Amino acid sequence: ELPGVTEEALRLKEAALEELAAQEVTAPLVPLAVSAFLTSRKKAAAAELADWMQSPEGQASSLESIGRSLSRRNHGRSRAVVLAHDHDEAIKGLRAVAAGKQAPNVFSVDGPVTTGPVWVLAGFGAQHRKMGKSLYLRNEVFAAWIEKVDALVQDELGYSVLELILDDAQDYGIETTQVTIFAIQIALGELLRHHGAKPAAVIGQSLGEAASAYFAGGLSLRDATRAICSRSHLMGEGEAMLFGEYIRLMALVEYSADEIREVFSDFPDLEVCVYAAPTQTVIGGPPEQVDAILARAEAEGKFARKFATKGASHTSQMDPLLGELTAELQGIKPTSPTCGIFSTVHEGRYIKPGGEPIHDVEYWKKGLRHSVYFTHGIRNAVDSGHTTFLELAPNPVALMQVALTTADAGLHDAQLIPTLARKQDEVSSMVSTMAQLYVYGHDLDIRTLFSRASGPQDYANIPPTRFK
Ligand SMILES: *S(O)(O)Oc1ccc(OCc2c(F)cc(-n3cnc(NS(C)(=O)=O)n3)cc2F)cc1
Ligand SMILES: OC[C@H]1O[C@@](CO)(O[C@H]2O[C@H](CO)[C@@H](O)[C@H](O)[C@H]2O)[C@@H](O)[C@@H]1O
Ligand SMILES: OC[C@H]1O[C@@](CO)(O[C@H]2O[C@H](CO)[C@@H](O)[C@H](O)[C@H]2O)[C@@H](O)[C@@H]1O
Ligand SMILES: OC[C@H]1O[C@@](CO)(O[C@H]2O[C@H](CO)[C@@H](O)[C@H](O)[C@H]2O)[C@@H](O)[C@@H]1O
Ligand SMILES: OC[C@H]1O[C@@](CO)(O[C@H]2O[C@H](CO)[C@@H](O)[C@H](O)[C@H]2O)[C@@H](O)[C@@H]1O
Ligand SMILES: OC[C@H]1O[C@@](CO)(O[C@H]2O[C@H](CO)[C@@H](O)[C@H](O)[C@H]2O)[C@@H](O)[C@@H]1O
Numbered sequence: 001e002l003p004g005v006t007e008e009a010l011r012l013k014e015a016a017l018e019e020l021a022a023q024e025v026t027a028p029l030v031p032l033a034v035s036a037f038l039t040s041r042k043k044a045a046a047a048e049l050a051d052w053m054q055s056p057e058g059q060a061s062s063l064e065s066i067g068r069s070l071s072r073r074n075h076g077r078s079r080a081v082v083l084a085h086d087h088d089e090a091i092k093g094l095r096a097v098a099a100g101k102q103a104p105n106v107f108s109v110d111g112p113v114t115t116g117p118v119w120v121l122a123g124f125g126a127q128h129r130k131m132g133k134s135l136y137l138r139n140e141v142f143a144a145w146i147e148k149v150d151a152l153v154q155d156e157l158g159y160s161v162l163e164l165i166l167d168d169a170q171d172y173g174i175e176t177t178q179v180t181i182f183a184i185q186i187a188l189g190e191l192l193r194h195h196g197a198k199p200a201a202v203i204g205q206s207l208g209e210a211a212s213a214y215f216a217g218g219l220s221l222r223d224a225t226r227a228i229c230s231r232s233h234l235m236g237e238g239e240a241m242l243f244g245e246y247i248r249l250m251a252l253v254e255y256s257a258d259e260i261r262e263v264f265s266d267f268p269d270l271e272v273c274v275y276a277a278p279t280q281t282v283i284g285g286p287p288e289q290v291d292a293i294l295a296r297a298e299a300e301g302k303f304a305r306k307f308a309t310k311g312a313s314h315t316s317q318m319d320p321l322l323g324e325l326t327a328e329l330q331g332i333k334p335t336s337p338t339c340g341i342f343s344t345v346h347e348g349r350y351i352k353p354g355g356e357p358i359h360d361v362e363y364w365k366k367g368l369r370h371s372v373y374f375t376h377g378i379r380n381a382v383d384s385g386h387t388t389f390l391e392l393a394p395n396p397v398a399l400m401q402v403a404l405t406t407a408d409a410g411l412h413d414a415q416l417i418p419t420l421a422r423k424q425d426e427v428s429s430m431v432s433t434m435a436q437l438y439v440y441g442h443d444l445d446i447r448t449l450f451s452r453a454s455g456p457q458d459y460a461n462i463p464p465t466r467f468k
Contacts (some may be wrong), residue, residue: 002151003151004151006154008163009166013137017137020168026222027085027427028085029085029427032094033073033080033083033435034046034070034097035077035079037245039110044098046080046095046318048097050094050098053090053094062461064450065458066462068335068453069459069462071449073463078110079104079307079438080097080108080109081436082096082097082106086213107436115384117388117442118202118388119212120392120398121165121203121206121207122206122393123178123205124397127172127181128395130165130385131184131394132180133165133168134311134425134427135430136166137192137296139192141190142191145187146183147162147427149182149221151285152221153229157232161179164382174235176236178232179228179232181207181393181394182225182228184213184393188392188420189214192437194448195448196444199340200340201216201340201350201386202216202341202342203338203341203344203381204344206274209296209344209345210227210231218334219333219335220333231325236421237310238321239272239311240310243310248286248310248312249285249312250309250312252305253281253294253304253423254281254302256281259279263293266293266296267359270284271285271312271373274314275376277374277408277468280401313368314370318369319369321368322368332359332361334358334360336354336355337352337355343358345370345372347376373444375404378402379405382410382414387413387414388440389406389416390419392419395420396419402416415436434446438453
């Protein structure tokens with residue numbers, strides 16, 4: 001018997017819905033799928049659909065009806081999806097598919113990807129004021145999972161994350177950024193599962209490790225929530241008492257791990273927080289040393305960027321918190337993974353499905369305290385055959401780090417699939433995510449992207465639903 005949705009959440013939700021009702025309805029993004037055993041035949045189907053869609057009868061059919069009909073075809077080896085708001089975009093996109101040409105709304109491949117997708121759970125640097133709000137108001141499944149995490153977090157820390165999502169006046173801090181991005185991560189992944197997708201493996205960075213543990217079957221939703229709540233509040237409370245000589249900055253520098261080993265001989269107190277990309281590393285330490293290594297970087301033409309925090313996670317400054325984190329996590333129950341795990345806590349090494357559990361109290365201490373081996377995990381995934389990396393986040397920050405490691409590992413055409421992004425319609429974005437999973441042959445029931453038909457006008461007069 002968990003807490004319910006707070007009264008203030010409901011209040012904020014009613015105001016938000018009026019805000020939504022009084023806005024101009026935008027044309028939805030529809031996925032149009034064509035496929036064939038042969039790419040040559042796929043291109044002809046795309047040309048035939050474009051022709052019919054140019055005809056008066058095609059023009060008279062809604063995109064949603066056309067796409068619902070396409071979704072009931074057999075789905076062949078060679079695939080394409082044209083994402084469209086109207087008949088113009090669709091016909092344009094289909095002509096590109098027919099012509100073998102690239103367009104920004106078009107995905108087309110000769111055959112499925114060989115290995116299943118890696119779900120990427122990062123989070124840092126992805127937050128913004130209204131993250132998750134639009135999809136909450138507009139997707140029943142997304143909203144159900146948000147509320148499930150909101151009840152658990154309510155019960156664990158005593159406040160409502162859903163109030164933060166719904167109230168535009170409020171913005172996120174070191175604590176609430178983590179628990180709220182977690183909630184968005186859980187809800188995005190369960191929405192994806194709802195339409196048939198699943199992770200082949202998971203990889204986490206810093207914040208996202210708790211969600212990655214849930215989706216890998218290493219911890220119940222309750223214990224994953226305990227993992228992100230204890231981490232988050234200790235970090236925010238600890239960092240707020242940091243002043244003067246106790247302050248520790250974090251910064252991004254264009255140095256590799258090997259460069260760092262040599263550059264750090266001038267900086268005794270600097271530590272590595274995150275190995276982000278082959279030539280991007282996040283360091284932490286006392287402000288004067290951080291300022292000097294930044295100065296050193298910019299003098300060598302390398303770029304460098306100070307983050308906004310008075311404390312540095314994944315350094316020794318976390319040693320005061322570990323005792324309390326240990327106490328708060330007593331009772332969690334680590335379970336055997338149900339998909340692969342690239343563990344950026346354990347130096348980037350792989351854990352097979354059915355392996356021994358890894359997510360014990362010591363795992364969360366080690367993760368908070370020690371470096372995040374993100375680029376090593378990604379490289380390990382590339383080297384064992386993975387090419388599709390799907391990021392669950394309000395903004396696709398980590399995907400840019402993945403691109404750097406995949407290109408550097410020789411993979412020059414990875415499938416980098418984002419989810420949400422500020423200033424992209426959150427329902428469009430999720431359509432596009434699931435349309436890509438389909439093109440590459442990953443698990444996804446494209447039929448579930450369209451509501452159940454309730455009448456013959458929900459179909460179009462094309463195969464497989466031609467009217468007798
Ligand atoms: S944990 O507590 O959440 O700690 C943690 C994890 C990950 C972090 O870094 C994420 C990150 C990153 F690795 C790189 C960038 N990035 C690349 N390029 C730029 N901008 S610039 C100066 O080239 O124009 N920024 C950003 C980012 F958030 C940090 C802490
Ligand atoms: O939602 C827009 C509109 O609603 C008002 C109340 O009429 O404020 C509601 O929404 C705000 C944004 O989330 C909240 O901060 C506020 O608490 C809530 O009452 C208007 O002030 C606003 O223009
Ligand atoms: O501890 C002395 C030792 O560390 C250096 C490294 O640059 O400085 C740091 O330690 C000081 C405390 O003694 C701090 O005041 C300072 O913020 C920190 O960078 C040198 O002073 C020396 O090699
Ligand atoms: O501030 C100077 C410092 O910045 C760098 C880039 O990190 O250069 C920029 O500033 C110079 C002065 O305006 C410009 O001439 C240069 O084109 C610009 O990139 C460093 O090279 C320099 O040390
Ligand atoms: O102030 C640094 C800035 O000055 C330039 C010349 O505009 O370089 C000078 O300073 C360097 C030391 O930082 C010397 O190595 C160099 O010989 C001298 O010309 C810029 O190149 C630099 O960004
Ligand atoms: O080829 C089968 C393979 O395709 C996916 C999507 O990548 O599912 C499609 O094919 C199914 C029929 O085999 C349809 O039920 C489904 O609607 C369609 O997306 C994968 O999920 C499936 O393994």
